[PDB]
Each structure stands twice: as structure tokens, then as C-alpha cells.
Coordinates of C-alpha atoms in Angstrom, one line a residue:
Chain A
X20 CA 9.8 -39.1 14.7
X21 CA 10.7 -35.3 14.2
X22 CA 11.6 -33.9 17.3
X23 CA 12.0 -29.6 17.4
X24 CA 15.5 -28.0 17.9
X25 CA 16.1 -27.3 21.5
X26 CA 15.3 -23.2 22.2
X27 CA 15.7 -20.9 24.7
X28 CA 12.7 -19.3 26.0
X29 CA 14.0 -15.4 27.1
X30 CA 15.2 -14.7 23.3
X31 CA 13.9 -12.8 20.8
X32 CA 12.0 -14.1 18.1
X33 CA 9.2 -14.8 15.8
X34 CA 8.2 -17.5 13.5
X35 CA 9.1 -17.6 10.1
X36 CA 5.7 -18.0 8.0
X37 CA 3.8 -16.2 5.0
X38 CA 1.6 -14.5 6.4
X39 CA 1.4 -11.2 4.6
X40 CA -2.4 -11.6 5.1
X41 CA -2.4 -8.6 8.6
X42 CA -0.7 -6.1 6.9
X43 CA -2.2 -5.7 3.7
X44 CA -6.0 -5.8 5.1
X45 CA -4.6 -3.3 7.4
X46 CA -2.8 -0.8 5.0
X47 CA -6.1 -1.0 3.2
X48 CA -8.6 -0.3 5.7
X49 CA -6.2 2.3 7.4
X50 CA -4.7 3.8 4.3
X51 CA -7.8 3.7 1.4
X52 CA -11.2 2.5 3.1
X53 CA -11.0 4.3 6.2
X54 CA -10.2 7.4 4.3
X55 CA -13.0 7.5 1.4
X56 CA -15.8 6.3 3.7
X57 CA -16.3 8.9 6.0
X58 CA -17.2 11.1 2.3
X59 CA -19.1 8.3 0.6
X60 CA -22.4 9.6 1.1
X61 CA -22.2 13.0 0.1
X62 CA -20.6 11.7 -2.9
X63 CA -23.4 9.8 -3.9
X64 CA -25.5 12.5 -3.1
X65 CA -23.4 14.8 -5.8
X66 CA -23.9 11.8 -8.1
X67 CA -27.9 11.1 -7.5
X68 CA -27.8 14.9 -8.2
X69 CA -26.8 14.3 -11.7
X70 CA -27.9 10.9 -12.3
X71 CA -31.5 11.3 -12.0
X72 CA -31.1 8.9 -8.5
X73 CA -29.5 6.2 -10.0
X74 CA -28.3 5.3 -6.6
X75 CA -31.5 5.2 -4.5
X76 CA -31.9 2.3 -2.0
X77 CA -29.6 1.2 0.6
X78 CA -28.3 -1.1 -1.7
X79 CA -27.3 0.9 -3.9
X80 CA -25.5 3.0 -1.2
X81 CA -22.5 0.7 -0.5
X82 CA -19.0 0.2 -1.6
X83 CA -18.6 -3.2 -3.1
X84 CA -15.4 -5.0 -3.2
X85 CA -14.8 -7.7 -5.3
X86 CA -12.8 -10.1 -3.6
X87 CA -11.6 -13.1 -6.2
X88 CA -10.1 -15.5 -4.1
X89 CA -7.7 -16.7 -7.4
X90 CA -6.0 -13.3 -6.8
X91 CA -6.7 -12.5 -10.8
X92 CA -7.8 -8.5 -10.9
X93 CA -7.5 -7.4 -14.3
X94 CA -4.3 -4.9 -15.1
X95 CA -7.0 -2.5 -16.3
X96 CA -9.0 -2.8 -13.5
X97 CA -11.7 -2.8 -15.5
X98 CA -15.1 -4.6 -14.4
X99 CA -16.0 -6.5 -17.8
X100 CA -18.5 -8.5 -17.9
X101 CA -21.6 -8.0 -20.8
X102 CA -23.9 -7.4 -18.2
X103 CA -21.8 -4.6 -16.1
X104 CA -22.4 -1.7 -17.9
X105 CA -20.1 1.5 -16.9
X106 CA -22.2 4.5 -16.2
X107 CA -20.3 6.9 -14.3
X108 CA -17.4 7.4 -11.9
X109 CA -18.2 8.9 -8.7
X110 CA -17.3 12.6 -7.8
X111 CA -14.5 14.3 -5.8
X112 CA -15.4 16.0 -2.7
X113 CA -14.3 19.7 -2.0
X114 CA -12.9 18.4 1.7
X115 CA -10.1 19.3 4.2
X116 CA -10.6 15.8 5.8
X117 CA -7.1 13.6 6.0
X118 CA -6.0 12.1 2.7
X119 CA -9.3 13.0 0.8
X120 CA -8.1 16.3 1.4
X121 CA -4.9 15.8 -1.6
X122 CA -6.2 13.1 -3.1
X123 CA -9.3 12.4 -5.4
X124 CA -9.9 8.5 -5.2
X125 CA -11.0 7.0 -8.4
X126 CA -14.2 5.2 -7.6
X127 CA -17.0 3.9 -10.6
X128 CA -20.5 3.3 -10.9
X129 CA -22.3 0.5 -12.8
X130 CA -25.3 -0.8 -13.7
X131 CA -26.8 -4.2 -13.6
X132 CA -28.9 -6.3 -16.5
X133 CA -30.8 -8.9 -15.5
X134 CA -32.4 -11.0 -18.4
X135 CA -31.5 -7.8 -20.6
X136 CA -33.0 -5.6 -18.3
X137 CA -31.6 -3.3 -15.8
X138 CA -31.5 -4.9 -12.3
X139 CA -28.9 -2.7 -10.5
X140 CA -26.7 -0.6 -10.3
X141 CA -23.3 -0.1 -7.6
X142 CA -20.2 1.2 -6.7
X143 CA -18.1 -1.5 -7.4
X144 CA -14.3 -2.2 -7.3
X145 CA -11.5 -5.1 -7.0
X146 CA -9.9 -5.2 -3.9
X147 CA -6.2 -3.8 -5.2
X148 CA -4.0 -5.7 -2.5
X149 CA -4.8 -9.1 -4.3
X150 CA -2.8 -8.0 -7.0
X151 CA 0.3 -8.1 -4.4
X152 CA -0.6 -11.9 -3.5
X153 CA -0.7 -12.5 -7.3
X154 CA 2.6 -10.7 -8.0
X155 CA 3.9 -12.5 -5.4
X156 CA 3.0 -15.7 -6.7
X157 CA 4.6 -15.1 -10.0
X158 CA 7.7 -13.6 -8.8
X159 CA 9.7 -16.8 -7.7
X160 CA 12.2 -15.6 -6.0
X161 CA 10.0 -14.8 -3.8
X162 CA 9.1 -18.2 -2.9
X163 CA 5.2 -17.9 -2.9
X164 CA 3.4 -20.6 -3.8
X165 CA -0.3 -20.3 -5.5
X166 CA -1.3 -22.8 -2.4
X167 CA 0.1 -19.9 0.1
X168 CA -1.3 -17.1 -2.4
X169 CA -4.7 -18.7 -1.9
X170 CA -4.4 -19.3 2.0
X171 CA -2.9 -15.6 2.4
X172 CA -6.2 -14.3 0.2
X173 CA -9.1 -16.2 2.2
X174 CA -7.5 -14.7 5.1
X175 CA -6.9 -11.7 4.0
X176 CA -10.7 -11.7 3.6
X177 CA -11.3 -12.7 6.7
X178 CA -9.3 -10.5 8.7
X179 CA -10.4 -7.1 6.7
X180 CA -13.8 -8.6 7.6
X181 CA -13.0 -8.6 11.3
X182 CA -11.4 -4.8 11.2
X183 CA -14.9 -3.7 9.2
X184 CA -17.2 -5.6 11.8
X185 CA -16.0 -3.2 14.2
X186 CA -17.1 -0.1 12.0
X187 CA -19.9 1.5 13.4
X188 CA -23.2 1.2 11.4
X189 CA -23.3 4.7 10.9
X190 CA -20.0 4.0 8.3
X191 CA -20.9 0.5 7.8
X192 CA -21.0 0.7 4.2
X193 CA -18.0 -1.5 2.4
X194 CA -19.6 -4.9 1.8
X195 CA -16.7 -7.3 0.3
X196 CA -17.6 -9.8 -2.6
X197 CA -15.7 -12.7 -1.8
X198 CA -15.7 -15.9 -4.8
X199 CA -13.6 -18.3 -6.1
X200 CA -14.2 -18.5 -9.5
X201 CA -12.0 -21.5 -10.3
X202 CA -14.6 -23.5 -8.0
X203 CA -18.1 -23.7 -8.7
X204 CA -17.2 -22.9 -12.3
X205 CA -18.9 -23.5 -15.3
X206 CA -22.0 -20.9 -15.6
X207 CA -20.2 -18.8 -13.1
X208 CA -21.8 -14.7 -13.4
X209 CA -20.2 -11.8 -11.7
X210 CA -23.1 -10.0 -12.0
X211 CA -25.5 -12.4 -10.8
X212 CA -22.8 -12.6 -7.9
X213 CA -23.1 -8.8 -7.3
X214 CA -26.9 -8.4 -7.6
X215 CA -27.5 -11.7 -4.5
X216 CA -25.2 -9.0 -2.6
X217 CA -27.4 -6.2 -3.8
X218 CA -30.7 -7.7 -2.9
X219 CA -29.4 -9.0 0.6
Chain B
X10 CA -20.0 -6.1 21.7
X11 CA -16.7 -6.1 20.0
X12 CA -14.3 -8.8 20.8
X13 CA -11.7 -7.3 22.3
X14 CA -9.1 -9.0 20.2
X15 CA -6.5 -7.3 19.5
X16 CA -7.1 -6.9 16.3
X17 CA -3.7 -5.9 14.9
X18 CA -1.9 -9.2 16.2
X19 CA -5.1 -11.7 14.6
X20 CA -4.6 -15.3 14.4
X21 CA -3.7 -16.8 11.2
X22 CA -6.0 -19.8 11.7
X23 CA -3.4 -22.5 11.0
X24 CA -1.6 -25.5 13.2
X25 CA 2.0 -23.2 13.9
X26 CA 5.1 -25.0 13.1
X27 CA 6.3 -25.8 16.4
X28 CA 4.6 -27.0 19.4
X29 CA 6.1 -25.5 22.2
X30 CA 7.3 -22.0 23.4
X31 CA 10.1 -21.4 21.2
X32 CA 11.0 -17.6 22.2
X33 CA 9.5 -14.5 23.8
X34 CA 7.3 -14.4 20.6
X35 CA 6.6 -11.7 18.7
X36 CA 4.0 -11.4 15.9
X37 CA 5.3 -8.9 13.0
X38 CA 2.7 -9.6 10.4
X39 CA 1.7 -6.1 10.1
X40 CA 5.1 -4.9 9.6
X41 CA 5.7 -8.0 6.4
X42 CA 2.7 -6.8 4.9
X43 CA 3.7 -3.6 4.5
X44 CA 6.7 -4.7 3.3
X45 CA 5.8 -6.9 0.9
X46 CA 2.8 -4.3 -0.5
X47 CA 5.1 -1.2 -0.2
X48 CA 7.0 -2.9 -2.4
X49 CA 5.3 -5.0 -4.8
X50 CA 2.5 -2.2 -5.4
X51 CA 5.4 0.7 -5.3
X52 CA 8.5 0.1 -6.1
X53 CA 8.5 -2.9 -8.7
X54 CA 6.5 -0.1 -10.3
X55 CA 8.6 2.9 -9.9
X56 CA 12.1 1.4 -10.4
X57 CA 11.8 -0.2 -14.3
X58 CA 13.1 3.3 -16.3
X59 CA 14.1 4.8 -13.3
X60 CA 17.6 5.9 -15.4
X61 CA 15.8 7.6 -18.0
X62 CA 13.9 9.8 -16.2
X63 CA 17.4 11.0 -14.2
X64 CA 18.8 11.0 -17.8
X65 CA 15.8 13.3 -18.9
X66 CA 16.0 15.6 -15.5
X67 CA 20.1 16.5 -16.3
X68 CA 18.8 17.6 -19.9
X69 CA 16.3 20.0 -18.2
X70 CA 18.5 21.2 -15.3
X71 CA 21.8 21.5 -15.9
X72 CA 23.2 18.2 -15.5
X73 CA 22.0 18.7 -11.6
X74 CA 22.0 14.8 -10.4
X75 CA 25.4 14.9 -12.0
X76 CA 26.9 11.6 -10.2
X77 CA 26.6 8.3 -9.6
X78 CA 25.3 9.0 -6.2
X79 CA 22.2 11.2 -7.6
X80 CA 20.7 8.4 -9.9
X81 CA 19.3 6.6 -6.8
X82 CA 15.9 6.9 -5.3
X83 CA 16.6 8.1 -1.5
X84 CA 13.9 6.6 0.7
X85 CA 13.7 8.3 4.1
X86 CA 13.0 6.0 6.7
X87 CA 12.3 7.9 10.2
X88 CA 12.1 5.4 12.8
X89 CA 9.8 7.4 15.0
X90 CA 7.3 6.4 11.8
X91 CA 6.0 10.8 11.7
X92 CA 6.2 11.5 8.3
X93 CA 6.1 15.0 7.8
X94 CA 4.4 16.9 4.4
X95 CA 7.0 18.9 3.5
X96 CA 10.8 18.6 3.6
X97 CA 11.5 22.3 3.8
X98 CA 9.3 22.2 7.2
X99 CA 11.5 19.5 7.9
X100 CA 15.1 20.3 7.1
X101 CA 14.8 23.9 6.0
X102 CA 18.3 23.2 4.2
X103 CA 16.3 20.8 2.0
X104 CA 15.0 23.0 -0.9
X105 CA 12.8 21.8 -3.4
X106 CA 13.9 22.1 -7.1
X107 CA 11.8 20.0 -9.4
X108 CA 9.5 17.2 -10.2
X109 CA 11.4 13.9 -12.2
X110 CA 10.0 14.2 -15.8
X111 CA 7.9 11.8 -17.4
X112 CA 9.2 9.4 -20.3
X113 CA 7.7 7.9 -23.3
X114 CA 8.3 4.3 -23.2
X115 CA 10.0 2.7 -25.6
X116 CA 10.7 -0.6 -23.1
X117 CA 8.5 -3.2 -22.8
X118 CA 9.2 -3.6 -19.2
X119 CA 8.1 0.4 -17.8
X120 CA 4.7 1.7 -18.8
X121 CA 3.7 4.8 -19.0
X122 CA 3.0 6.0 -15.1
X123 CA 2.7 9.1 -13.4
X124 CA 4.0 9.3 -10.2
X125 CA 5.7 12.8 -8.4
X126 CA 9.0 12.6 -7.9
X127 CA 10.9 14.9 -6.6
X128 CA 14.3 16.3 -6.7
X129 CA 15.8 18.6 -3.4
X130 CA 18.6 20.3 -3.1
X131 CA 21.0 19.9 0.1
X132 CA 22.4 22.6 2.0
X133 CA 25.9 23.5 4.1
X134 CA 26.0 26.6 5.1
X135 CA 23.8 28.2 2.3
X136 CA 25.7 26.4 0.2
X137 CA 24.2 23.6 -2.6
X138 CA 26.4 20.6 -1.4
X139 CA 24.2 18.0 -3.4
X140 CA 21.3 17.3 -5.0
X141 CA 18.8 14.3 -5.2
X142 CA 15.8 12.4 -5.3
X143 CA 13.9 12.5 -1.9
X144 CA 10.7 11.1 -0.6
X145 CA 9.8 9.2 2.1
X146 CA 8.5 5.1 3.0
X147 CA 4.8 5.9 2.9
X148 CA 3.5 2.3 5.3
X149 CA 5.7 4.1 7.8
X150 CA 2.7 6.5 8.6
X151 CA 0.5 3.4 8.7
X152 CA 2.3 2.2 11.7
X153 CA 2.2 5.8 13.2
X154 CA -1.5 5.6 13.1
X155 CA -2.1 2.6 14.0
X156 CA 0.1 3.5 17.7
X157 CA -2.3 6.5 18.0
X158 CA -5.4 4.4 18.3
X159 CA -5.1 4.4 21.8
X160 CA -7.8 1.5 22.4
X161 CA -6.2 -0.2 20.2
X162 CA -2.8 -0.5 22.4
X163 CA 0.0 -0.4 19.9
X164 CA 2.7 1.3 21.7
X165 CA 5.5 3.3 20.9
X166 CA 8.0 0.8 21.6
X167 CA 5.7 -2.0 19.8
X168 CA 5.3 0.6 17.1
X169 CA 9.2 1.0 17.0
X170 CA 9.9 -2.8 17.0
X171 CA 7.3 -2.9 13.9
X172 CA 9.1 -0.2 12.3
X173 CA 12.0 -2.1 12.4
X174 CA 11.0 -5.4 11.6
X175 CA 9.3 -3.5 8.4
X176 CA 12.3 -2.3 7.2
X177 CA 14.0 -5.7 8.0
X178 CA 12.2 -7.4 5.6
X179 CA 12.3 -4.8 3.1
X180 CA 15.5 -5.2 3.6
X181 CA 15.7 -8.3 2.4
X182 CA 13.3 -8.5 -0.6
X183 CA 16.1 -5.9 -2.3
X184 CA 19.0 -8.1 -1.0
X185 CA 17.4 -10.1 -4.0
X186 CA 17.1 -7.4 -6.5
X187 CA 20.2 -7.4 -8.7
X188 CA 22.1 -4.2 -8.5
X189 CA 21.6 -3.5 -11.9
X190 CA 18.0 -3.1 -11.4
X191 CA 17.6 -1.8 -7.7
X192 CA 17.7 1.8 -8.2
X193 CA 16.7 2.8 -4.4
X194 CA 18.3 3.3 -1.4
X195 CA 17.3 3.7 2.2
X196 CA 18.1 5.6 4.7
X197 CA 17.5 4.4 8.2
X198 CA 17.3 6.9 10.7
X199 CA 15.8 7.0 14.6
X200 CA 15.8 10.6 15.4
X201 CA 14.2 10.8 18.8
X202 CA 17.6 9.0 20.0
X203 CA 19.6 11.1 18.5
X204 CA 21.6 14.3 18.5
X205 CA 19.8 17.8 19.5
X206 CA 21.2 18.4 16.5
X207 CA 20.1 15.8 14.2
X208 CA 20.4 17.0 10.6
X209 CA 18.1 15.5 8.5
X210 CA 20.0 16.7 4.9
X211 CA 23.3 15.6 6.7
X212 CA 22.1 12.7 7.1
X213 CA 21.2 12.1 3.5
X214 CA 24.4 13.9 2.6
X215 CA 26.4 11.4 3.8
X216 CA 24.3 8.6 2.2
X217 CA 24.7 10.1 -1.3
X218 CA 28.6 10.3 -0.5
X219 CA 28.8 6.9 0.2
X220 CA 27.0 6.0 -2.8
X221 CA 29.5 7.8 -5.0
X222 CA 32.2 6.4 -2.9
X223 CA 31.2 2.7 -4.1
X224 CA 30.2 3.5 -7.3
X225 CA 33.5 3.8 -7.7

């Protein structure tokens, strides 16, 4: 029994709703992934090249995201978990190529244990934006609830997922982690998580 | 086979809150976003300390932001969304002194950060007729891109309307900010529609004047 307010069709307007979801996949893609992509590669190259090959397979070759869909990326931005293991970050480029070209990216390799044994190793990050959503969350005033902080994150996911699609396979190297660790939770491992990715 | 969706004005894969045409609709996600990220990622993180860095600059230079209206952060805003490297290449009466110093925190609130800030003096006839921190709203070259992929659409007037919106809500996330703690100020600016004399450090002249006129 709630009938709409009356509006008038030739003025200009646009709906008022949360959905911060657009722009931050895009300022990501366009203004970090985009940028350290094209160089990927040849970075891992300059790391094999010290690293006895650490980084040999295709799956090994990738840029995984980590993608909590609880928004909670440590402060640190450490990956902690007892059987991540830190090895190395990954090296600059020399490079003249657009944003690269000032700036030197902090990116980090780790390895894998399986069952105490080494299983893996990546290039693996948390997806930065999510601390936004989370931020956003907290700060009140803002009027964020964690129900719109978890509706904003899954798509968020999705839409970066749609812009990355499009990537030609040549670049098609970002593959996002996407969990929710507050379901399914109990024995929940991040790096059995990480190696499934791996091996698929 | 892509889509072709336009991929910049995606769905948000919810019932909307009215069931009818409501307006000429327009879809300004991208430009919240940015908003909301610029601002929550930058200047939540810039702004706590703010003061004492100023403080530490006037020590080192000769009391040089001397005024109420240089302690603020001047963000440049260009409408047209190009944002240029250097400020000398873009208002040659803009002239680069030095980088805001670094402080050792003794607050609980401002960590220990390193961003480069930098301080510009303004020119009138050859003349120093102000001094301040300068930089320019970094998602604003986001938008810019975005127009350029020409496949993707994005026009210049969509761009500009974005550009707008963007600031918009920026706009209003400070309205909430109490004065006390919101240490930046914008300046808003189209210059493709204006003068064939636009001057850029005019323009931010008369910003700082106005912010030394109400600071009493």
C-alpha cells in the first residue's frame, strides 16, 4: 500500500543507492592492475633469475588477489598464515611505460606448505579497495551498513571480474581469490584456498 | 565474444527502489567510487597531523605558509579531468619550493606516512604573492582515461558530468568533516570554458585569499 512520489520524466536525476561497487573495481583495474601487468612477466623473469625458478609453471605465473568478502585485510597487509612463508618481493622494472615508469609497485612472493612440505609458491596480495568498504563500514557517519559493505564487496568482485574477462589472454594473468571466511568456517585454510587456485 | 556491455555503467544486480521511470536517469557509480576511495584511501590518511607538518615547514623556511590561508591542502580540481605532471608546465608562475617535512608522531591518531607534498610559490608579475600547498585530485585522471577508450564510449560530455558528480559527492563526505579536522580545500575549476586567459595560480590566489578572509 506504498505508492511512489509522482516524478517528472524530462529532469535530471539519479537514484540514490550505495553502490560504490563501479568505481573502485574501476580505479583499480585502470589505476594499479592495468598498469603492473603489461611488466609482470619480465618481472618474474628478473626473479626466476635469482630464485633458482621458483616461479616456473603457469601457475606460478599469475597475480593472485585475495578477495575476503568480510572486507578484513590486515593494516599490515601482511599474508600470515603458518603455512605462507615470505620468500621474496618481486623486482622493479627499468621501464618508460605509464605509471610503472615513476613508480615501483610493491608486489611479494610466497611459498606454499602442504603437510609440511612445499606445495607452491605465488605472487599473492589483498585486494586494497576492500579496506575502503571496511572503513566505510566503521565510519558511521557514513551510514554504511556491514549488510551494504558485504553486498558492495561481492559485487565489487563481480564487476572487476567482468572488466578482467575482457583482458586478452595474452595479459590474462590476475586471478582473484574470492572467500568468505565467516561462512564455511571452522577448519577454514588460506593456503589450501590458494593452492585449489594454484592447481586449477 | 565480448558482451558489448557497457562496461562502465554495469548493473548492480538488485530490485531498484522505484518501479517506474523516475527521471532522465543517469548512472554515476563510477564517479561515487572515486569519491568515496579518493577519500577514504587518501585523505582520511593525509589530513590527521596535517598542522604539524605546516608547523615544521615554517621552521625550515622562513615562516613561508605564514597565514591561516597557507595551512590548508589546495586540491586542484580541472574539470576537463587532464592532469598535468608538472605545475611549472602548467602555470609557469607556479614555482616549486619544497617538499612538506615528515613528523615523528607523537599522536595516536597520524602514523608515521610518507607521502610528497609539496609547497609552490604564486606569482604576479615576478612577484611572490603567496605560497602554498598544491597538488592535484588524482581519480580525476581516471575519468580522463576512461573517455579516451574510444570503444568504450565515455564522452567528453559524459566524462564532464562524471567529473562533476565526483566532486559532488566529495563534496559532501567533507560537509561532514568537522572544521577542526578538515584541513583541505578544493578548487573547482572548468578551464576549457573559460577565459583565453585562464590563470591557473590566479585562480588559487584567490582561493587562498578567501581562506584568510574567513579565517578571520
Amino acid at each position: 500500500g506504498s505508492h511512489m512520489a509522482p516524478a517528472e520524466v524530462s529532469a535530471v536525476c539519479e537514484e540514490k543507492n550505495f553502490n560504490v561497487a563501479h568505481g573502485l573495481a574501476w580505479s583499480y583495474y585502470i589505476g594499479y592492475l592495468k598498469l603492473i601487468l603489461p611488466g609482470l612477466q619480465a618481472r618474474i623473469r628478473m626473479f626466476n633469475q635469482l630464485h633458482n625458478n621458483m616461479l616456473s609453471g603457469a601457475g606460478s605465473r599469475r597475480l593472485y588477489i585475495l578477495f575476503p568478502l568480510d572486507c578484513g585485510v590486515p593494516d599490515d597487509l601482511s599474508v600470515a598464515d603458518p603455512n605462507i612463508r615470505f620468500r621474496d618481493m618481486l623486482p622493479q622494472q627499468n621501464t618508460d611505460r605509464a605509471g610503472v615508469k615513476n613508480r615501483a609497485y610493491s608486489n611479494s612472493v610466497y611459498e606454499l606448505l602442504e603437510n609440511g612440505q612445499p606445495a607452491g609458491a605465488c605472487i599473492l596480495e589483498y585486494a586494497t579497495p576492500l579496506q575502503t568498504l571496511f572503513a566505510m563500514s566503521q565510519d558511521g557517519k557514513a551510514g554504511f551498513s556491514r549488510e551494504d559493505r558485504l553486498e558492495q564487496a561481492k559485487l565489487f568482485c563481480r564487476t572487476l571480474e567482468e572488466i578482467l574477462a575482457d583482458v586478452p589472454e595474452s595479459r590474462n594473468h590476475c586471478r582473484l581469490i574470492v572467500y568468505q571466511e565467516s561462512e564455511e568456517g571452522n577448519s577454514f585454510s588460506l593456503s589450501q584456498e590458494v593452492l585449489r587456485h594454484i592447481r586449477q
